Amino acid sequence: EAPNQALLRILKETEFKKIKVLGSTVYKGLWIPEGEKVKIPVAIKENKEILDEAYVMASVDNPHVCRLLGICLTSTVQLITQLMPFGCLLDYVREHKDNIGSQYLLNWCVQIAKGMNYLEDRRLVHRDLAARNVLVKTPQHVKITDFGLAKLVPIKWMALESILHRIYTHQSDVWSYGVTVWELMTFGSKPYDGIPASEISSILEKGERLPQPPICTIDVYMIMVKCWMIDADSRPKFRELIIEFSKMARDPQRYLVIQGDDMDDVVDADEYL
């Protein structure tokens, strides 16, 4: 009901340099706003769908969500955004599975919940929350991205009511939050590995759920289980998840049990306002 006064910035292609490939296309590069004396590390993602994505990314502004810097309209529609140098959190947990402590895991849970609470504040349902869609700015700071599915298909992350009746709500996102947390606490295991997507709705209806990760106390796993209640309004709210994971982050070893616990003018997008 409130007007969306977000600014869509159209960026000249001549302001982008050092373009190199990250995956397939998404590239890294440098954005030098003309007449600004600043170099900004960026990712660039290479039509109604990409622009629906650009619409949502330009309309968010929160420390735990990735925002659109602008678009470039040359041969292709390119989305320009802050470079998140450590890549996706799923690949990060898998590679550093032996250097990741309780403080980091719980802090990431708090930050993802903050991002999702903000989206709820903005009446946005993400619909694709997953560890592959959280990026790592630094090991201390992650942010939610990939809004090409958000509104005002990944079966193994979806609430049962979404699989059965294509019903999507903030509380359906809470279910996906629970699955994302399970991915982190297993250092990136695949949910329901080897179980075909077609059989997922059947398993969930019988009462089966993802199992307790070895490092998780019952305190942490019980929160995960609450996100998978059949009654959507019985699941936690994101603002409650922030609270509970914050409490646990003050004493992380009580809640997770882990054995062993081009440079002069560079400005990060978070300091470029």
**Placement of tokens 């694709």 in the chain:** 128
Residue 11 or 83 having the CB closest to ligand A1CEL = 83
How far apart CA 123 and CA 184 sit, in angstroms, is 26
**Placement of tokens 């502004």 in the chain:** 61
Cβ 23 to ligand A1CEL shortest distance, Å: 3
Binding site for ligand A1CEL (CB under 6 A): 22-23, 26, 28, 43, 45, 79, 81, 83-85, 87-88, 91, 135, 145-146
Residue 58 or 215 having the CB closest to ligand A1CEL = 58
- Residue 18, both tokens: 């050092």
Residue 100's contacts (CB-CB under 8 Å, 6 or more residues apart) are: 93, 187, 258
**Could you tell me which residues are annotated as the binding site?**
22-26, 45, 81-82, 146
Cβ 251 to ligand A1CEL shortest distance, Å: 32
SS3 81: strand
128 tagged catalytic: yes
User: Catalytic: which of 128, 219, 268, 270?
Assistant: 128
**Could you tell me which residues are annotated as the binding site for ATP?**
22-26, 45, 81-82, 146
Residue 79 or 229 having the CB closest to ligand A1CEL = 79
How far apart CA 15 and CA 50 sit, in angstroms, is 21
Residue 6 or 258 having the CB closest to ligand A1CEL = 6
How far apart CA 158 and CA 200 sit, in angstroms, is 10
How far apart CA 90 and CA 189 sit, in angstroms, is 9
Cβ 27 to ligand A1CEL shortest distance, Å: 8
- Residue 54, both tokens: 């650009």
- The residues annotated as belonging to the active site are 128
